[PDB]
Amino acid sequence: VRSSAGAVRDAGGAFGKREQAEEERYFRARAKEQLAALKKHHENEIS
Amino acid sequence: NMMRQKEQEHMINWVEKRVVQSISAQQEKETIAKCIADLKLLSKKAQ
Amino acid sequence: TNTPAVISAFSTMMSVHRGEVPCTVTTASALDEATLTELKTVLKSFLSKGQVLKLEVKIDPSIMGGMIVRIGEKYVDMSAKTKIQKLSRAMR
Amino acid sequence: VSSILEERILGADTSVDLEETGRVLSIGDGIARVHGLRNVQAEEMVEFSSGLKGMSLNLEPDNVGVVVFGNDKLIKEGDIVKRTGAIVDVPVGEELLGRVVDALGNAIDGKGPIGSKARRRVGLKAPGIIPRISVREPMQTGIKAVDSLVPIGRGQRELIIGDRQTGKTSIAIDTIINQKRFNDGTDEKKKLYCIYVAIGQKRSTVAQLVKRLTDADAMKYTIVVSATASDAAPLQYLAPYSGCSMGEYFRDNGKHALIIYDDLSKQAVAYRQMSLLLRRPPGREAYPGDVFYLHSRLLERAAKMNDAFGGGSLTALPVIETQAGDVSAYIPTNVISITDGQIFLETELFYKGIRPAINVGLSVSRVGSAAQTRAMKQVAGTMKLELAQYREVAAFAQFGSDLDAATQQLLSRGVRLTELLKQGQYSPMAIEEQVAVIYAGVRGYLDKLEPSKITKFENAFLSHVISQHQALLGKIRTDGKISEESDAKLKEIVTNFLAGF
Amino acid sequence: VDLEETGRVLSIGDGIARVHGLRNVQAEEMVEFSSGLKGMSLNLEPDNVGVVVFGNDKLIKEGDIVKRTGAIVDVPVGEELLGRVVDALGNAIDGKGPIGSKARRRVGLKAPGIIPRISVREPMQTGIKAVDSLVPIGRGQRELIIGDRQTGKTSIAIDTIINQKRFNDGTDEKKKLYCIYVAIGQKRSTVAQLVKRLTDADAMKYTIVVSATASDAAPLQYLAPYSGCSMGEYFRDNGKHALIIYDDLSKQAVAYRQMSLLLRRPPGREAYPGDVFYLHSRLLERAAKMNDAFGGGSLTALPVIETQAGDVSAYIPTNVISITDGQIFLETELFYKGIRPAINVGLSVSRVGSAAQTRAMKQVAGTMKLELAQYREVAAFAQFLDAATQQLLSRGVRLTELLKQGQYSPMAIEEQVAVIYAGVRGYLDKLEPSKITKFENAFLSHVISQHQALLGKIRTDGKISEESDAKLKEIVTNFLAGF
Amino acid sequence: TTGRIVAVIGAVVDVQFDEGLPPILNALEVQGRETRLVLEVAQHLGESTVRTIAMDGTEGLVRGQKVLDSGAPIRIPVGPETLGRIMNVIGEPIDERGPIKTKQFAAIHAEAPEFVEMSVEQEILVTGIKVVDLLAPYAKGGKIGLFGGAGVGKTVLIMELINNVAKAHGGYSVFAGVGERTREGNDLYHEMIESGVINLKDATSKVALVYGQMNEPPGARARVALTGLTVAEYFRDQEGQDVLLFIDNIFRFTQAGSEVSALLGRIPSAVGYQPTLATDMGTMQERITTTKKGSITSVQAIYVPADDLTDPAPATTFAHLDATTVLSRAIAELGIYPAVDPLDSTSRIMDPNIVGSEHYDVARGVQKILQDYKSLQDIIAILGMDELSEEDKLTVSRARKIQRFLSQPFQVAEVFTGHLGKLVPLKETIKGFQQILAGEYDHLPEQAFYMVGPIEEAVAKADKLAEEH
Numbered sequence A: 001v002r003s004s005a006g007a008v009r010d011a012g013g014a015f016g017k018r019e020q021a022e023e024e025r026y027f028r029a030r031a032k033e034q035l036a037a038l039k040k041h042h043e044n045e046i047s
Numbered sequence B: 001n002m003m004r005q006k007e008q009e010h011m012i013n014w015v016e017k018r019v020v021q022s023i024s025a026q027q028e029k030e031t032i033a034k035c036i037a038d039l040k041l042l043s044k045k046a047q
Numbered sequence C: 001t002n003t004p005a006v007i008s009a010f011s012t013m014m015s016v017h018r019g020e021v022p023c024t025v026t027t028a029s030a031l032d033e034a035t036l037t038e039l040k041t042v043l044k045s046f047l048s049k050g051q052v053l054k055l056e057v058k059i060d061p062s063i064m065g066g067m068i069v070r071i072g073e074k075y076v077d078m079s080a081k082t083k084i085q086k087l088s089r090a091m092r
Numbered sequence D: 001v002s003s004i005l006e007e008r009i010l011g012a013d014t015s016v017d018l019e020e021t022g023r024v025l026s027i028g029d030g031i032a033r034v035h036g037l038r039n040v041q042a043e044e045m046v047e048f049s050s051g052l053k054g055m056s057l058n059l060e061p062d063n064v065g066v067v068v069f070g071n072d073k074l075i076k077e078g079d080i081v082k083r084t085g086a087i088v089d090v091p092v093g094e095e096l097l098g099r100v101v102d103a104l105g106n107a108i109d110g111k112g113p114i115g116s117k118a119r120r121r122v123g124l125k126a127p128g129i130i131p132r133i134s135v136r137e138p139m140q141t142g143i144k145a146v147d148s149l150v151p152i153g154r155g156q157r158e159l160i161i162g163d164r165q166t167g168k169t170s171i172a173i174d175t176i177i178n179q180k181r182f183n184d185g186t187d188e189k190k191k192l193y194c195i196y197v198a199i200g201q202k203r204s205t206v207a208q209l210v211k212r213l214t215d216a217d218a219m220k221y222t223i224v225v226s227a228t229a230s231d232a233a234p235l236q237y238l239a240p241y242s243g244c245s246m247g248e249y250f251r252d253n254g255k256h257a258l259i260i261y262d263d264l265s266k267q268a269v270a271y272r273q274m275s276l277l278l279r280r281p282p283g284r285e286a287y288p289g290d291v292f293y294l295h296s297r298l299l300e301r302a303a304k305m306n307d308a309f310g311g312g313s314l315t316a317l318p319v320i321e322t323q324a325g326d327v328s329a330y331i332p333t334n335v336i337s338i339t340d341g342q343i344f345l346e347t348e349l350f351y352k353g354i355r356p357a358i359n360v361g362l363s364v365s366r367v368g369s370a371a372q373t374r375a376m377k378q379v380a381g382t383m384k385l386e387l388a389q390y391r392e393v394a395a396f397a398q399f400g401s402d403l404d405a406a407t408q409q410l411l412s413r414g415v416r417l418t419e420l421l422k423q424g425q426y427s428p429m430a431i432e433e434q435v436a437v438i439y440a441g442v443r444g445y446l447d448k449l450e451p452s453k454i455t456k457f458e459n460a461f462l463s464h465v466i467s468q469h470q471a472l473l474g475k476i477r478t479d480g481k482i483s484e485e486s487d488a489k490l491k492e493i494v495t496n497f498l499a500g501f
Numbered sequence E: 001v002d003l004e005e006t007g008r009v010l011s012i013g014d015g016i017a018r019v020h021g022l023r024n025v026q027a028e029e030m031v032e033f034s035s036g037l038k039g040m041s042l043n044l045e046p047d048n049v050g051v052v053v054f055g056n057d058k059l060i061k062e063g064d065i066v067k068r069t070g071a072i073v074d075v076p077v078g079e080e081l082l083g084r085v086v087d088a089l090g091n092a093i094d095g096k097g098p099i100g101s102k103a104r105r106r107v108g109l110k111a112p113g114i115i116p117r118i119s120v121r122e123p124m125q126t127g128i129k130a131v132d133s134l135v136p137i138g139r140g141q142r143e144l145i146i147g148d149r150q151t152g153k154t155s156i157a158i159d160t161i162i163n164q165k166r167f168n169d170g171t172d173e174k175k176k177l178y179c180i181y182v183a184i185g186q187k188r189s190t191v192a193q194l195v196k197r198l199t200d201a202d203a204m205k206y207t208i209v210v211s212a213t214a215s216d217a218a219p220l221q222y223l224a225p226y227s228g229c230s231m232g233e234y235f236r237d238n239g240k241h242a243l244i245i246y247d248d249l250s251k252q253a254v255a256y257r258q259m260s261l262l263l264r265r266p267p268g269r270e271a272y273p274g275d276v277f278y279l280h281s282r283l284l285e286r287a288a289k290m291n292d293a294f295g296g297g298s299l300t301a302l303p304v305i306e307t308q309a310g311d312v313s314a315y316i317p318t319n320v321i322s323i324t325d326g327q328i329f330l331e332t333e334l335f336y337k338g339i340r341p342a343i344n345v346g347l348s349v350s351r352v353g354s355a356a357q358t359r360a361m362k363q364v365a366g367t368m369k370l371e372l373a374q375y376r377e378v379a380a381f382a383q384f385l386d387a388a389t390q391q392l393l394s395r396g397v398r399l400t401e402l403l404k405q406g407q408y409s410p411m412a413i414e415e416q417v418a419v420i421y422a423g424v425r426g427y428l429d430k431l432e433p434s435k436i437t438k439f440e441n442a443f444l445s446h447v448i449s450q451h452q453a454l455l456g457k458i459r460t461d462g463k464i465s466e467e468s469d470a471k472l473k474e475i476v477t478n479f480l481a482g483f
Numbered sequence F: 001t002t003g004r005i006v007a008v009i010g011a012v013v014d015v016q017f018d019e020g021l022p023p024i025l026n027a028l029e030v031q032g033r034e035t036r037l038v039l040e041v042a043q044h045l046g047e048s049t050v051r052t053i054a055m056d057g058t059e060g061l062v063r064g065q066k067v068l069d070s071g072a073p074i075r076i077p078v079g080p081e082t083l084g085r086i087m088n089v090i091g092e093p094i095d096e097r098g099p100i101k102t103k104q105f106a107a108i109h110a111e112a113p114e115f116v117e118m119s120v121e122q123e124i125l126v127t128g129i130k131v132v133d134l135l136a137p138y139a140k141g142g143k144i145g146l147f148g149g150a151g152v153g154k155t156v157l158i159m160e161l162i163n164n165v166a167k168a169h170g171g172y173s174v175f176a177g178v179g180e181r182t183r184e185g186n187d188l189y190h191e192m193i194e195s196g197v198i199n200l201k202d203a204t205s206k207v208a209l210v211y212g213q214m215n216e217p218p219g220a221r222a223r224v225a226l227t228g229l230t231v232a233e234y235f236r237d238q239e240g241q242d243v244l245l246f247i248d249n250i251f252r253f254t255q256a257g258s259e260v261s262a263l264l265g266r267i268p269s270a271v272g273y274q275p276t277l278a279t280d281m282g283t284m285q286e287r288i289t290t291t292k293k294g295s296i297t298s299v300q301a302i303y304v305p306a307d308d309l310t311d312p313a314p315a316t317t318f319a320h321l322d323a324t325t326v327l328s329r330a331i332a333e334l335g336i337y338p339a340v341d342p343l344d345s346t347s348r349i350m351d352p353n354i355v356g357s358e359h360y361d362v363a364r365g366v367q368k369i370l371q372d373y374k375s376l377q378d379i380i381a382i383l384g385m386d387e388l389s390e391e392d393k394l395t396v397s398r399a400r401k402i403q404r405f406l407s408q409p410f411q412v413a414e415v416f417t418g419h420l421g422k423l424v425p426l427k428e429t430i431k432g433f434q435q436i437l438a439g440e441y442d443h444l445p446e447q448a449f450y451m452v453g454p455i456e457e458a459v460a461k462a463d464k465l466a467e468e469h
Ligand SMILES: Nc1ncnc2c1ncn2[C@@H]1O[C@H](COP(=O)(O)OP(=O)(O)OP(=O)(O)O)[C@@H](O)[C@H]1O
Pocket: D163, D164, D165, D166, D167, D168, D169, D170, D171, D321, D355, D356, D423, D424, D425, F319, F347, F348, F350, F351
């Protein structure tokens, strides 16, 4: 009897979805700031 | 090689097909006598 | 419902009791009866001391030549057909 | 060409015989029920009229259950089965080396016929308890991980177990290729005559394999039996014994052999089919009760005869496929309790980049210290201890910092050793090059070198030792130990080289 | 005695009769026992015939005289069955009198091959906001309904059956969809309650109800789905659309397993015979959509499966999931957390799907799919927000509350479009999450009362015109401010 | 000859002969049937009986019906006259267009090519699919397989492979649908008429079709595979051509064998499958290999019951493939269509000698990063993403970028997603993944890589997403 790697998501339990919640927090916020930065960049390159 | 393979694999079929129609001749008595002799030898060597 | 199976078996049980070994000679084609005489007189050379021969001839043109002889179990095949396939096998 | 085929015809055997005979009562699913054959030995080769073979496996009181060695499309209720009197046997000798034979020792390579003189049964008994002598010689597999952490002596069964596509056949083929250096040299006490039994594979796979072996010019000493997926169940149940008999010939002829069954979990399936169709009682997972006797009486022929019976040998590397690391299934445990070890392969390791994907935590060898050369022994003792220390605290790896400098040292050593064990494909290394690399690894001559570069170093170092200090390597190899002079010379080479890179 | 056309029972027991004789009996032909009963000669052995008695074999004794009818099993069909409760053989059991049909039809018939069928194009309005929007169903499509005990599956079925009353009372005939409900293994009480609740909607004037309840011998439960499918194939062939709701199918699989373990046929997995796949496939492959050279009929099938402990990976649930053109995964914890009907979206696919929908509803459902997908990615945040993610959570809550629905209250497609458009256009993102229900009900009442013109426009033109969109937006805003 | 039916149990008919028995695998014609009913012999029960599996429903069979021995196994039409013609398991048209006028008939039960005939060459094939062409390149003329449960995308993926390779392929093609929906049958038929690969006016069709769709009896789903395989085997051997052979499913073949095995009086094996699973699959999957006479590129859609890859059916089939592309439902429910699992997928031609160092190392970097991401996911579930290291968040962001980038909008999925089909030449996939792994796009958002073709489309999407921000 043994375990594996990356199974806390495969089980699909409570942690398997809280993990998605956490990752999505982080990367939605990062995508927001990155979109703002890319805007800023193009709107500066207008000059 | 290829030509020789074709040649021999056709020779075998041609001659065997000739033989399977050549056996239809009237050599029956020779075969029967030979087989009875074979019976003689087998019976002798079977005990 | 299977009484005929019983008696038939019993016959096979009595035949061997009196010692009449089954035989059979499948021939390339029609056969003479003098040839059958020599055949019986030579097959009697296979029995033990006392047994009897019960030869059931059968004509067979499906084979090519020679003959197939069954005696009890012992099976000797000298039909030209098997010789032809044996030779083709060997030289293939 | 006709001038050639008449000696083909002449070289025949036209004679006939008074033979016994039964007649088929039934047929279907590949199982004839012959009736008669009153004097048929159990496990004997009978021949049907059409030309097939059969192995009269199940002598019942009234009929004999024969298993056809091929498609029974050619058989009909009424056909004639003529016994031959012979238990199943196969050709042997050194005529097979370089050929490809099927389960019954018939060249399926074209490439002419087998010219063997001597045949040999397939159901012989293993040598007793007195003939054998302890396992002492090593079998250099040429793989860093296998050859240092889980050694393999000659005369030892070493399961290679693991999930699908983790690199089992690759380990076996690296082992086969490595023996070239021995089989080209001079001494006859180091020549290994590899054999490779391919069961259940498809002929494309065996063809690619023989292509690899021919490219690496490793066929001049290899036999390759093959009972591929399309060959009827009996020819897969019977190939391992054909291989093991071809190897027993060498073993009892004072030579050293090596036989690789691949897989055995397909011989077991073929035997299960053969049994379930003969109607023998089933058991767990439907396997009969013999699926242990089956393997055991096979993997117990791999012996190491003493010096009175010749001194021969016969290694064995049964490959087993486990369904998602289910080592508790029936066959994996049946074949794990017969052998002297196991080289566990895992797919978490295969994709982390640790290739060959060996899992030193689960892999063990029950000969151990023996079956290594004193040089590799000196190096691998420390390497094994260091890796064991690393594994138990690798859980912190994802942090590393925020931890004591002692565990930081342990991680910074285990990482380098793990990266040193990574190896290429079909690139086995002589033992002395392995010793050189792992010496440069375990003595601290990399701890200050970033892990990402270790592989580079490794290769570079080899090329800088092979082409420069062949004398030192020969000194290590001819006497398989590191005399203080050789130790210091290795230290100097490692240090000065690392300095210039 | 005539052993060619008439045999004698050998060993009746537990429902299966061996019959000595009947030398000229066809496989799966119907024999009549001397006691009014009937049976179907399934096993044809070299000596005796294994017949299955369509009833209780109290009346059968060894020595009885079985006599074949001469025709493979068949059932009455026609328009004369509508609004009747019939037995699995076609014998009315509602006490309304003789069934009175002018045509029979075989049960073990063959599904229409490759050529007759044409792609699925029209919609089969279910009337359930969660199905028409997200997992739509087209006519000629087979759409499983799989869920644990008591999660509202017969609720989906009966909402679908009731909703067709909008269409079955109109002038058009390409929109009329007759319904068939096959009750396998239920209770007589449950079927009677179902018929009563159908009659209260006057939805029995165009429905048939085949009934093989729990007590009826195993063969009748095994044969009910085929009887229903034949009664529906009549309409499909004759150019009229149809529907059929097997409820459930797992009970048919159980009935077949019993019937096949009593004929001494060996078992397979879970003791089911080997064929429990060829049992359902044979049946579901009959739900076709014939092209226009074959009439243009159709037969939508809605097999209902009950998984054991939410175990979709069992034997029969995965035997049927691989046969149908989609799923409607009723979850038994969405059913408590509030969502009713418990349809689980994201797991509920419709391998035909979008092509079936109606453009009007497609306009809004396309956007709703994405909004809800994001909401379900980030709905695991009760554990703990940004402006955008806060907006997404709010919008998702609004839409989820919109999907909820009453019971036996299907709503027209135009009203569904009205509500969904209101929700997906941001004219809700300020209301209290629990106010959505009352707002939705009141909005329905309003728009039904006053703006029958706009709903009629959407329904007739099938799409939200720009003028239609403008008027709809005006109503939504003038009401929300009036809320 | 002429025998009699003595028993009819389920879909297994026992026929008693007084003349000579017919060998196994022969075809028997039951007389007096409106639709031709053809049995195949599968046993010799002894006592001059035989037991046969029927290829059509056994309704109306009467104990005693006379049965005619054909003489040779099921023979079907073959040749270029079966192109664009749908066929039964027994090669009789089911497209209502009249007989198949051919010259050569072929018997479906043939033998596999022997070892001396195997061809040992292998060279990449370009399917224009990012994930497939990158992590699991498809050998030309080599057996392929598309595992994965139900509803993951096997049929859509085969539709894509048809759409691309079929037309972009010179030689003929064959599609042998075994035991799958009939709706998909005519959907394929109509799609192919639209594409023009099948023409109903001229003899310019390129695809033959064979159909044993799942409404047929189990006896006729275990053999339709062999019918399609026979047609393709003829186009390989006699026509000296290049053939594409699509099979879908090829698990219904083993299932349909399992359905009748029990009635043939056989003890049932591990999971209810017939005892002879492995060899019945071997005798079929080894008439599909490429040989020295011709080339067959065989794409097979293999079901996986309940997404269990350990089941005996897929577990056995894994040994008969070059490239195995295991679709996953865990990845199909993230919207990453095609659902391929980048870690379960494997190929035989993924050796740097056959794809070169650039491609090999790009792919192995991708796999390493995805596995490391899986390892971290165990941690992110306790901590939360914030408490991670600073070098890790980089790896997680890169893994997410790659995972999204492996998706792609298919030409046949224009009706599901509403997108436009994209193809990606191999070099461009390598370029894009090199850049992503190197960090050249580490500034872009993740949703820029979702459902885009070449990487340049990723940058354009990043722009258009930042504009509306
Ligand atoms: N040392 C290695 N370095 C890089 N890749 C490797 C190595 N060893 C094996 N592989 C890869 O692993 C894959 C599978 O290899 P192999 O066939 O040896 O495993 P297997 O378990 O025998 O496969 P199967 O079980 O399907 O027969 C190969 O494609 C090969 O590229």
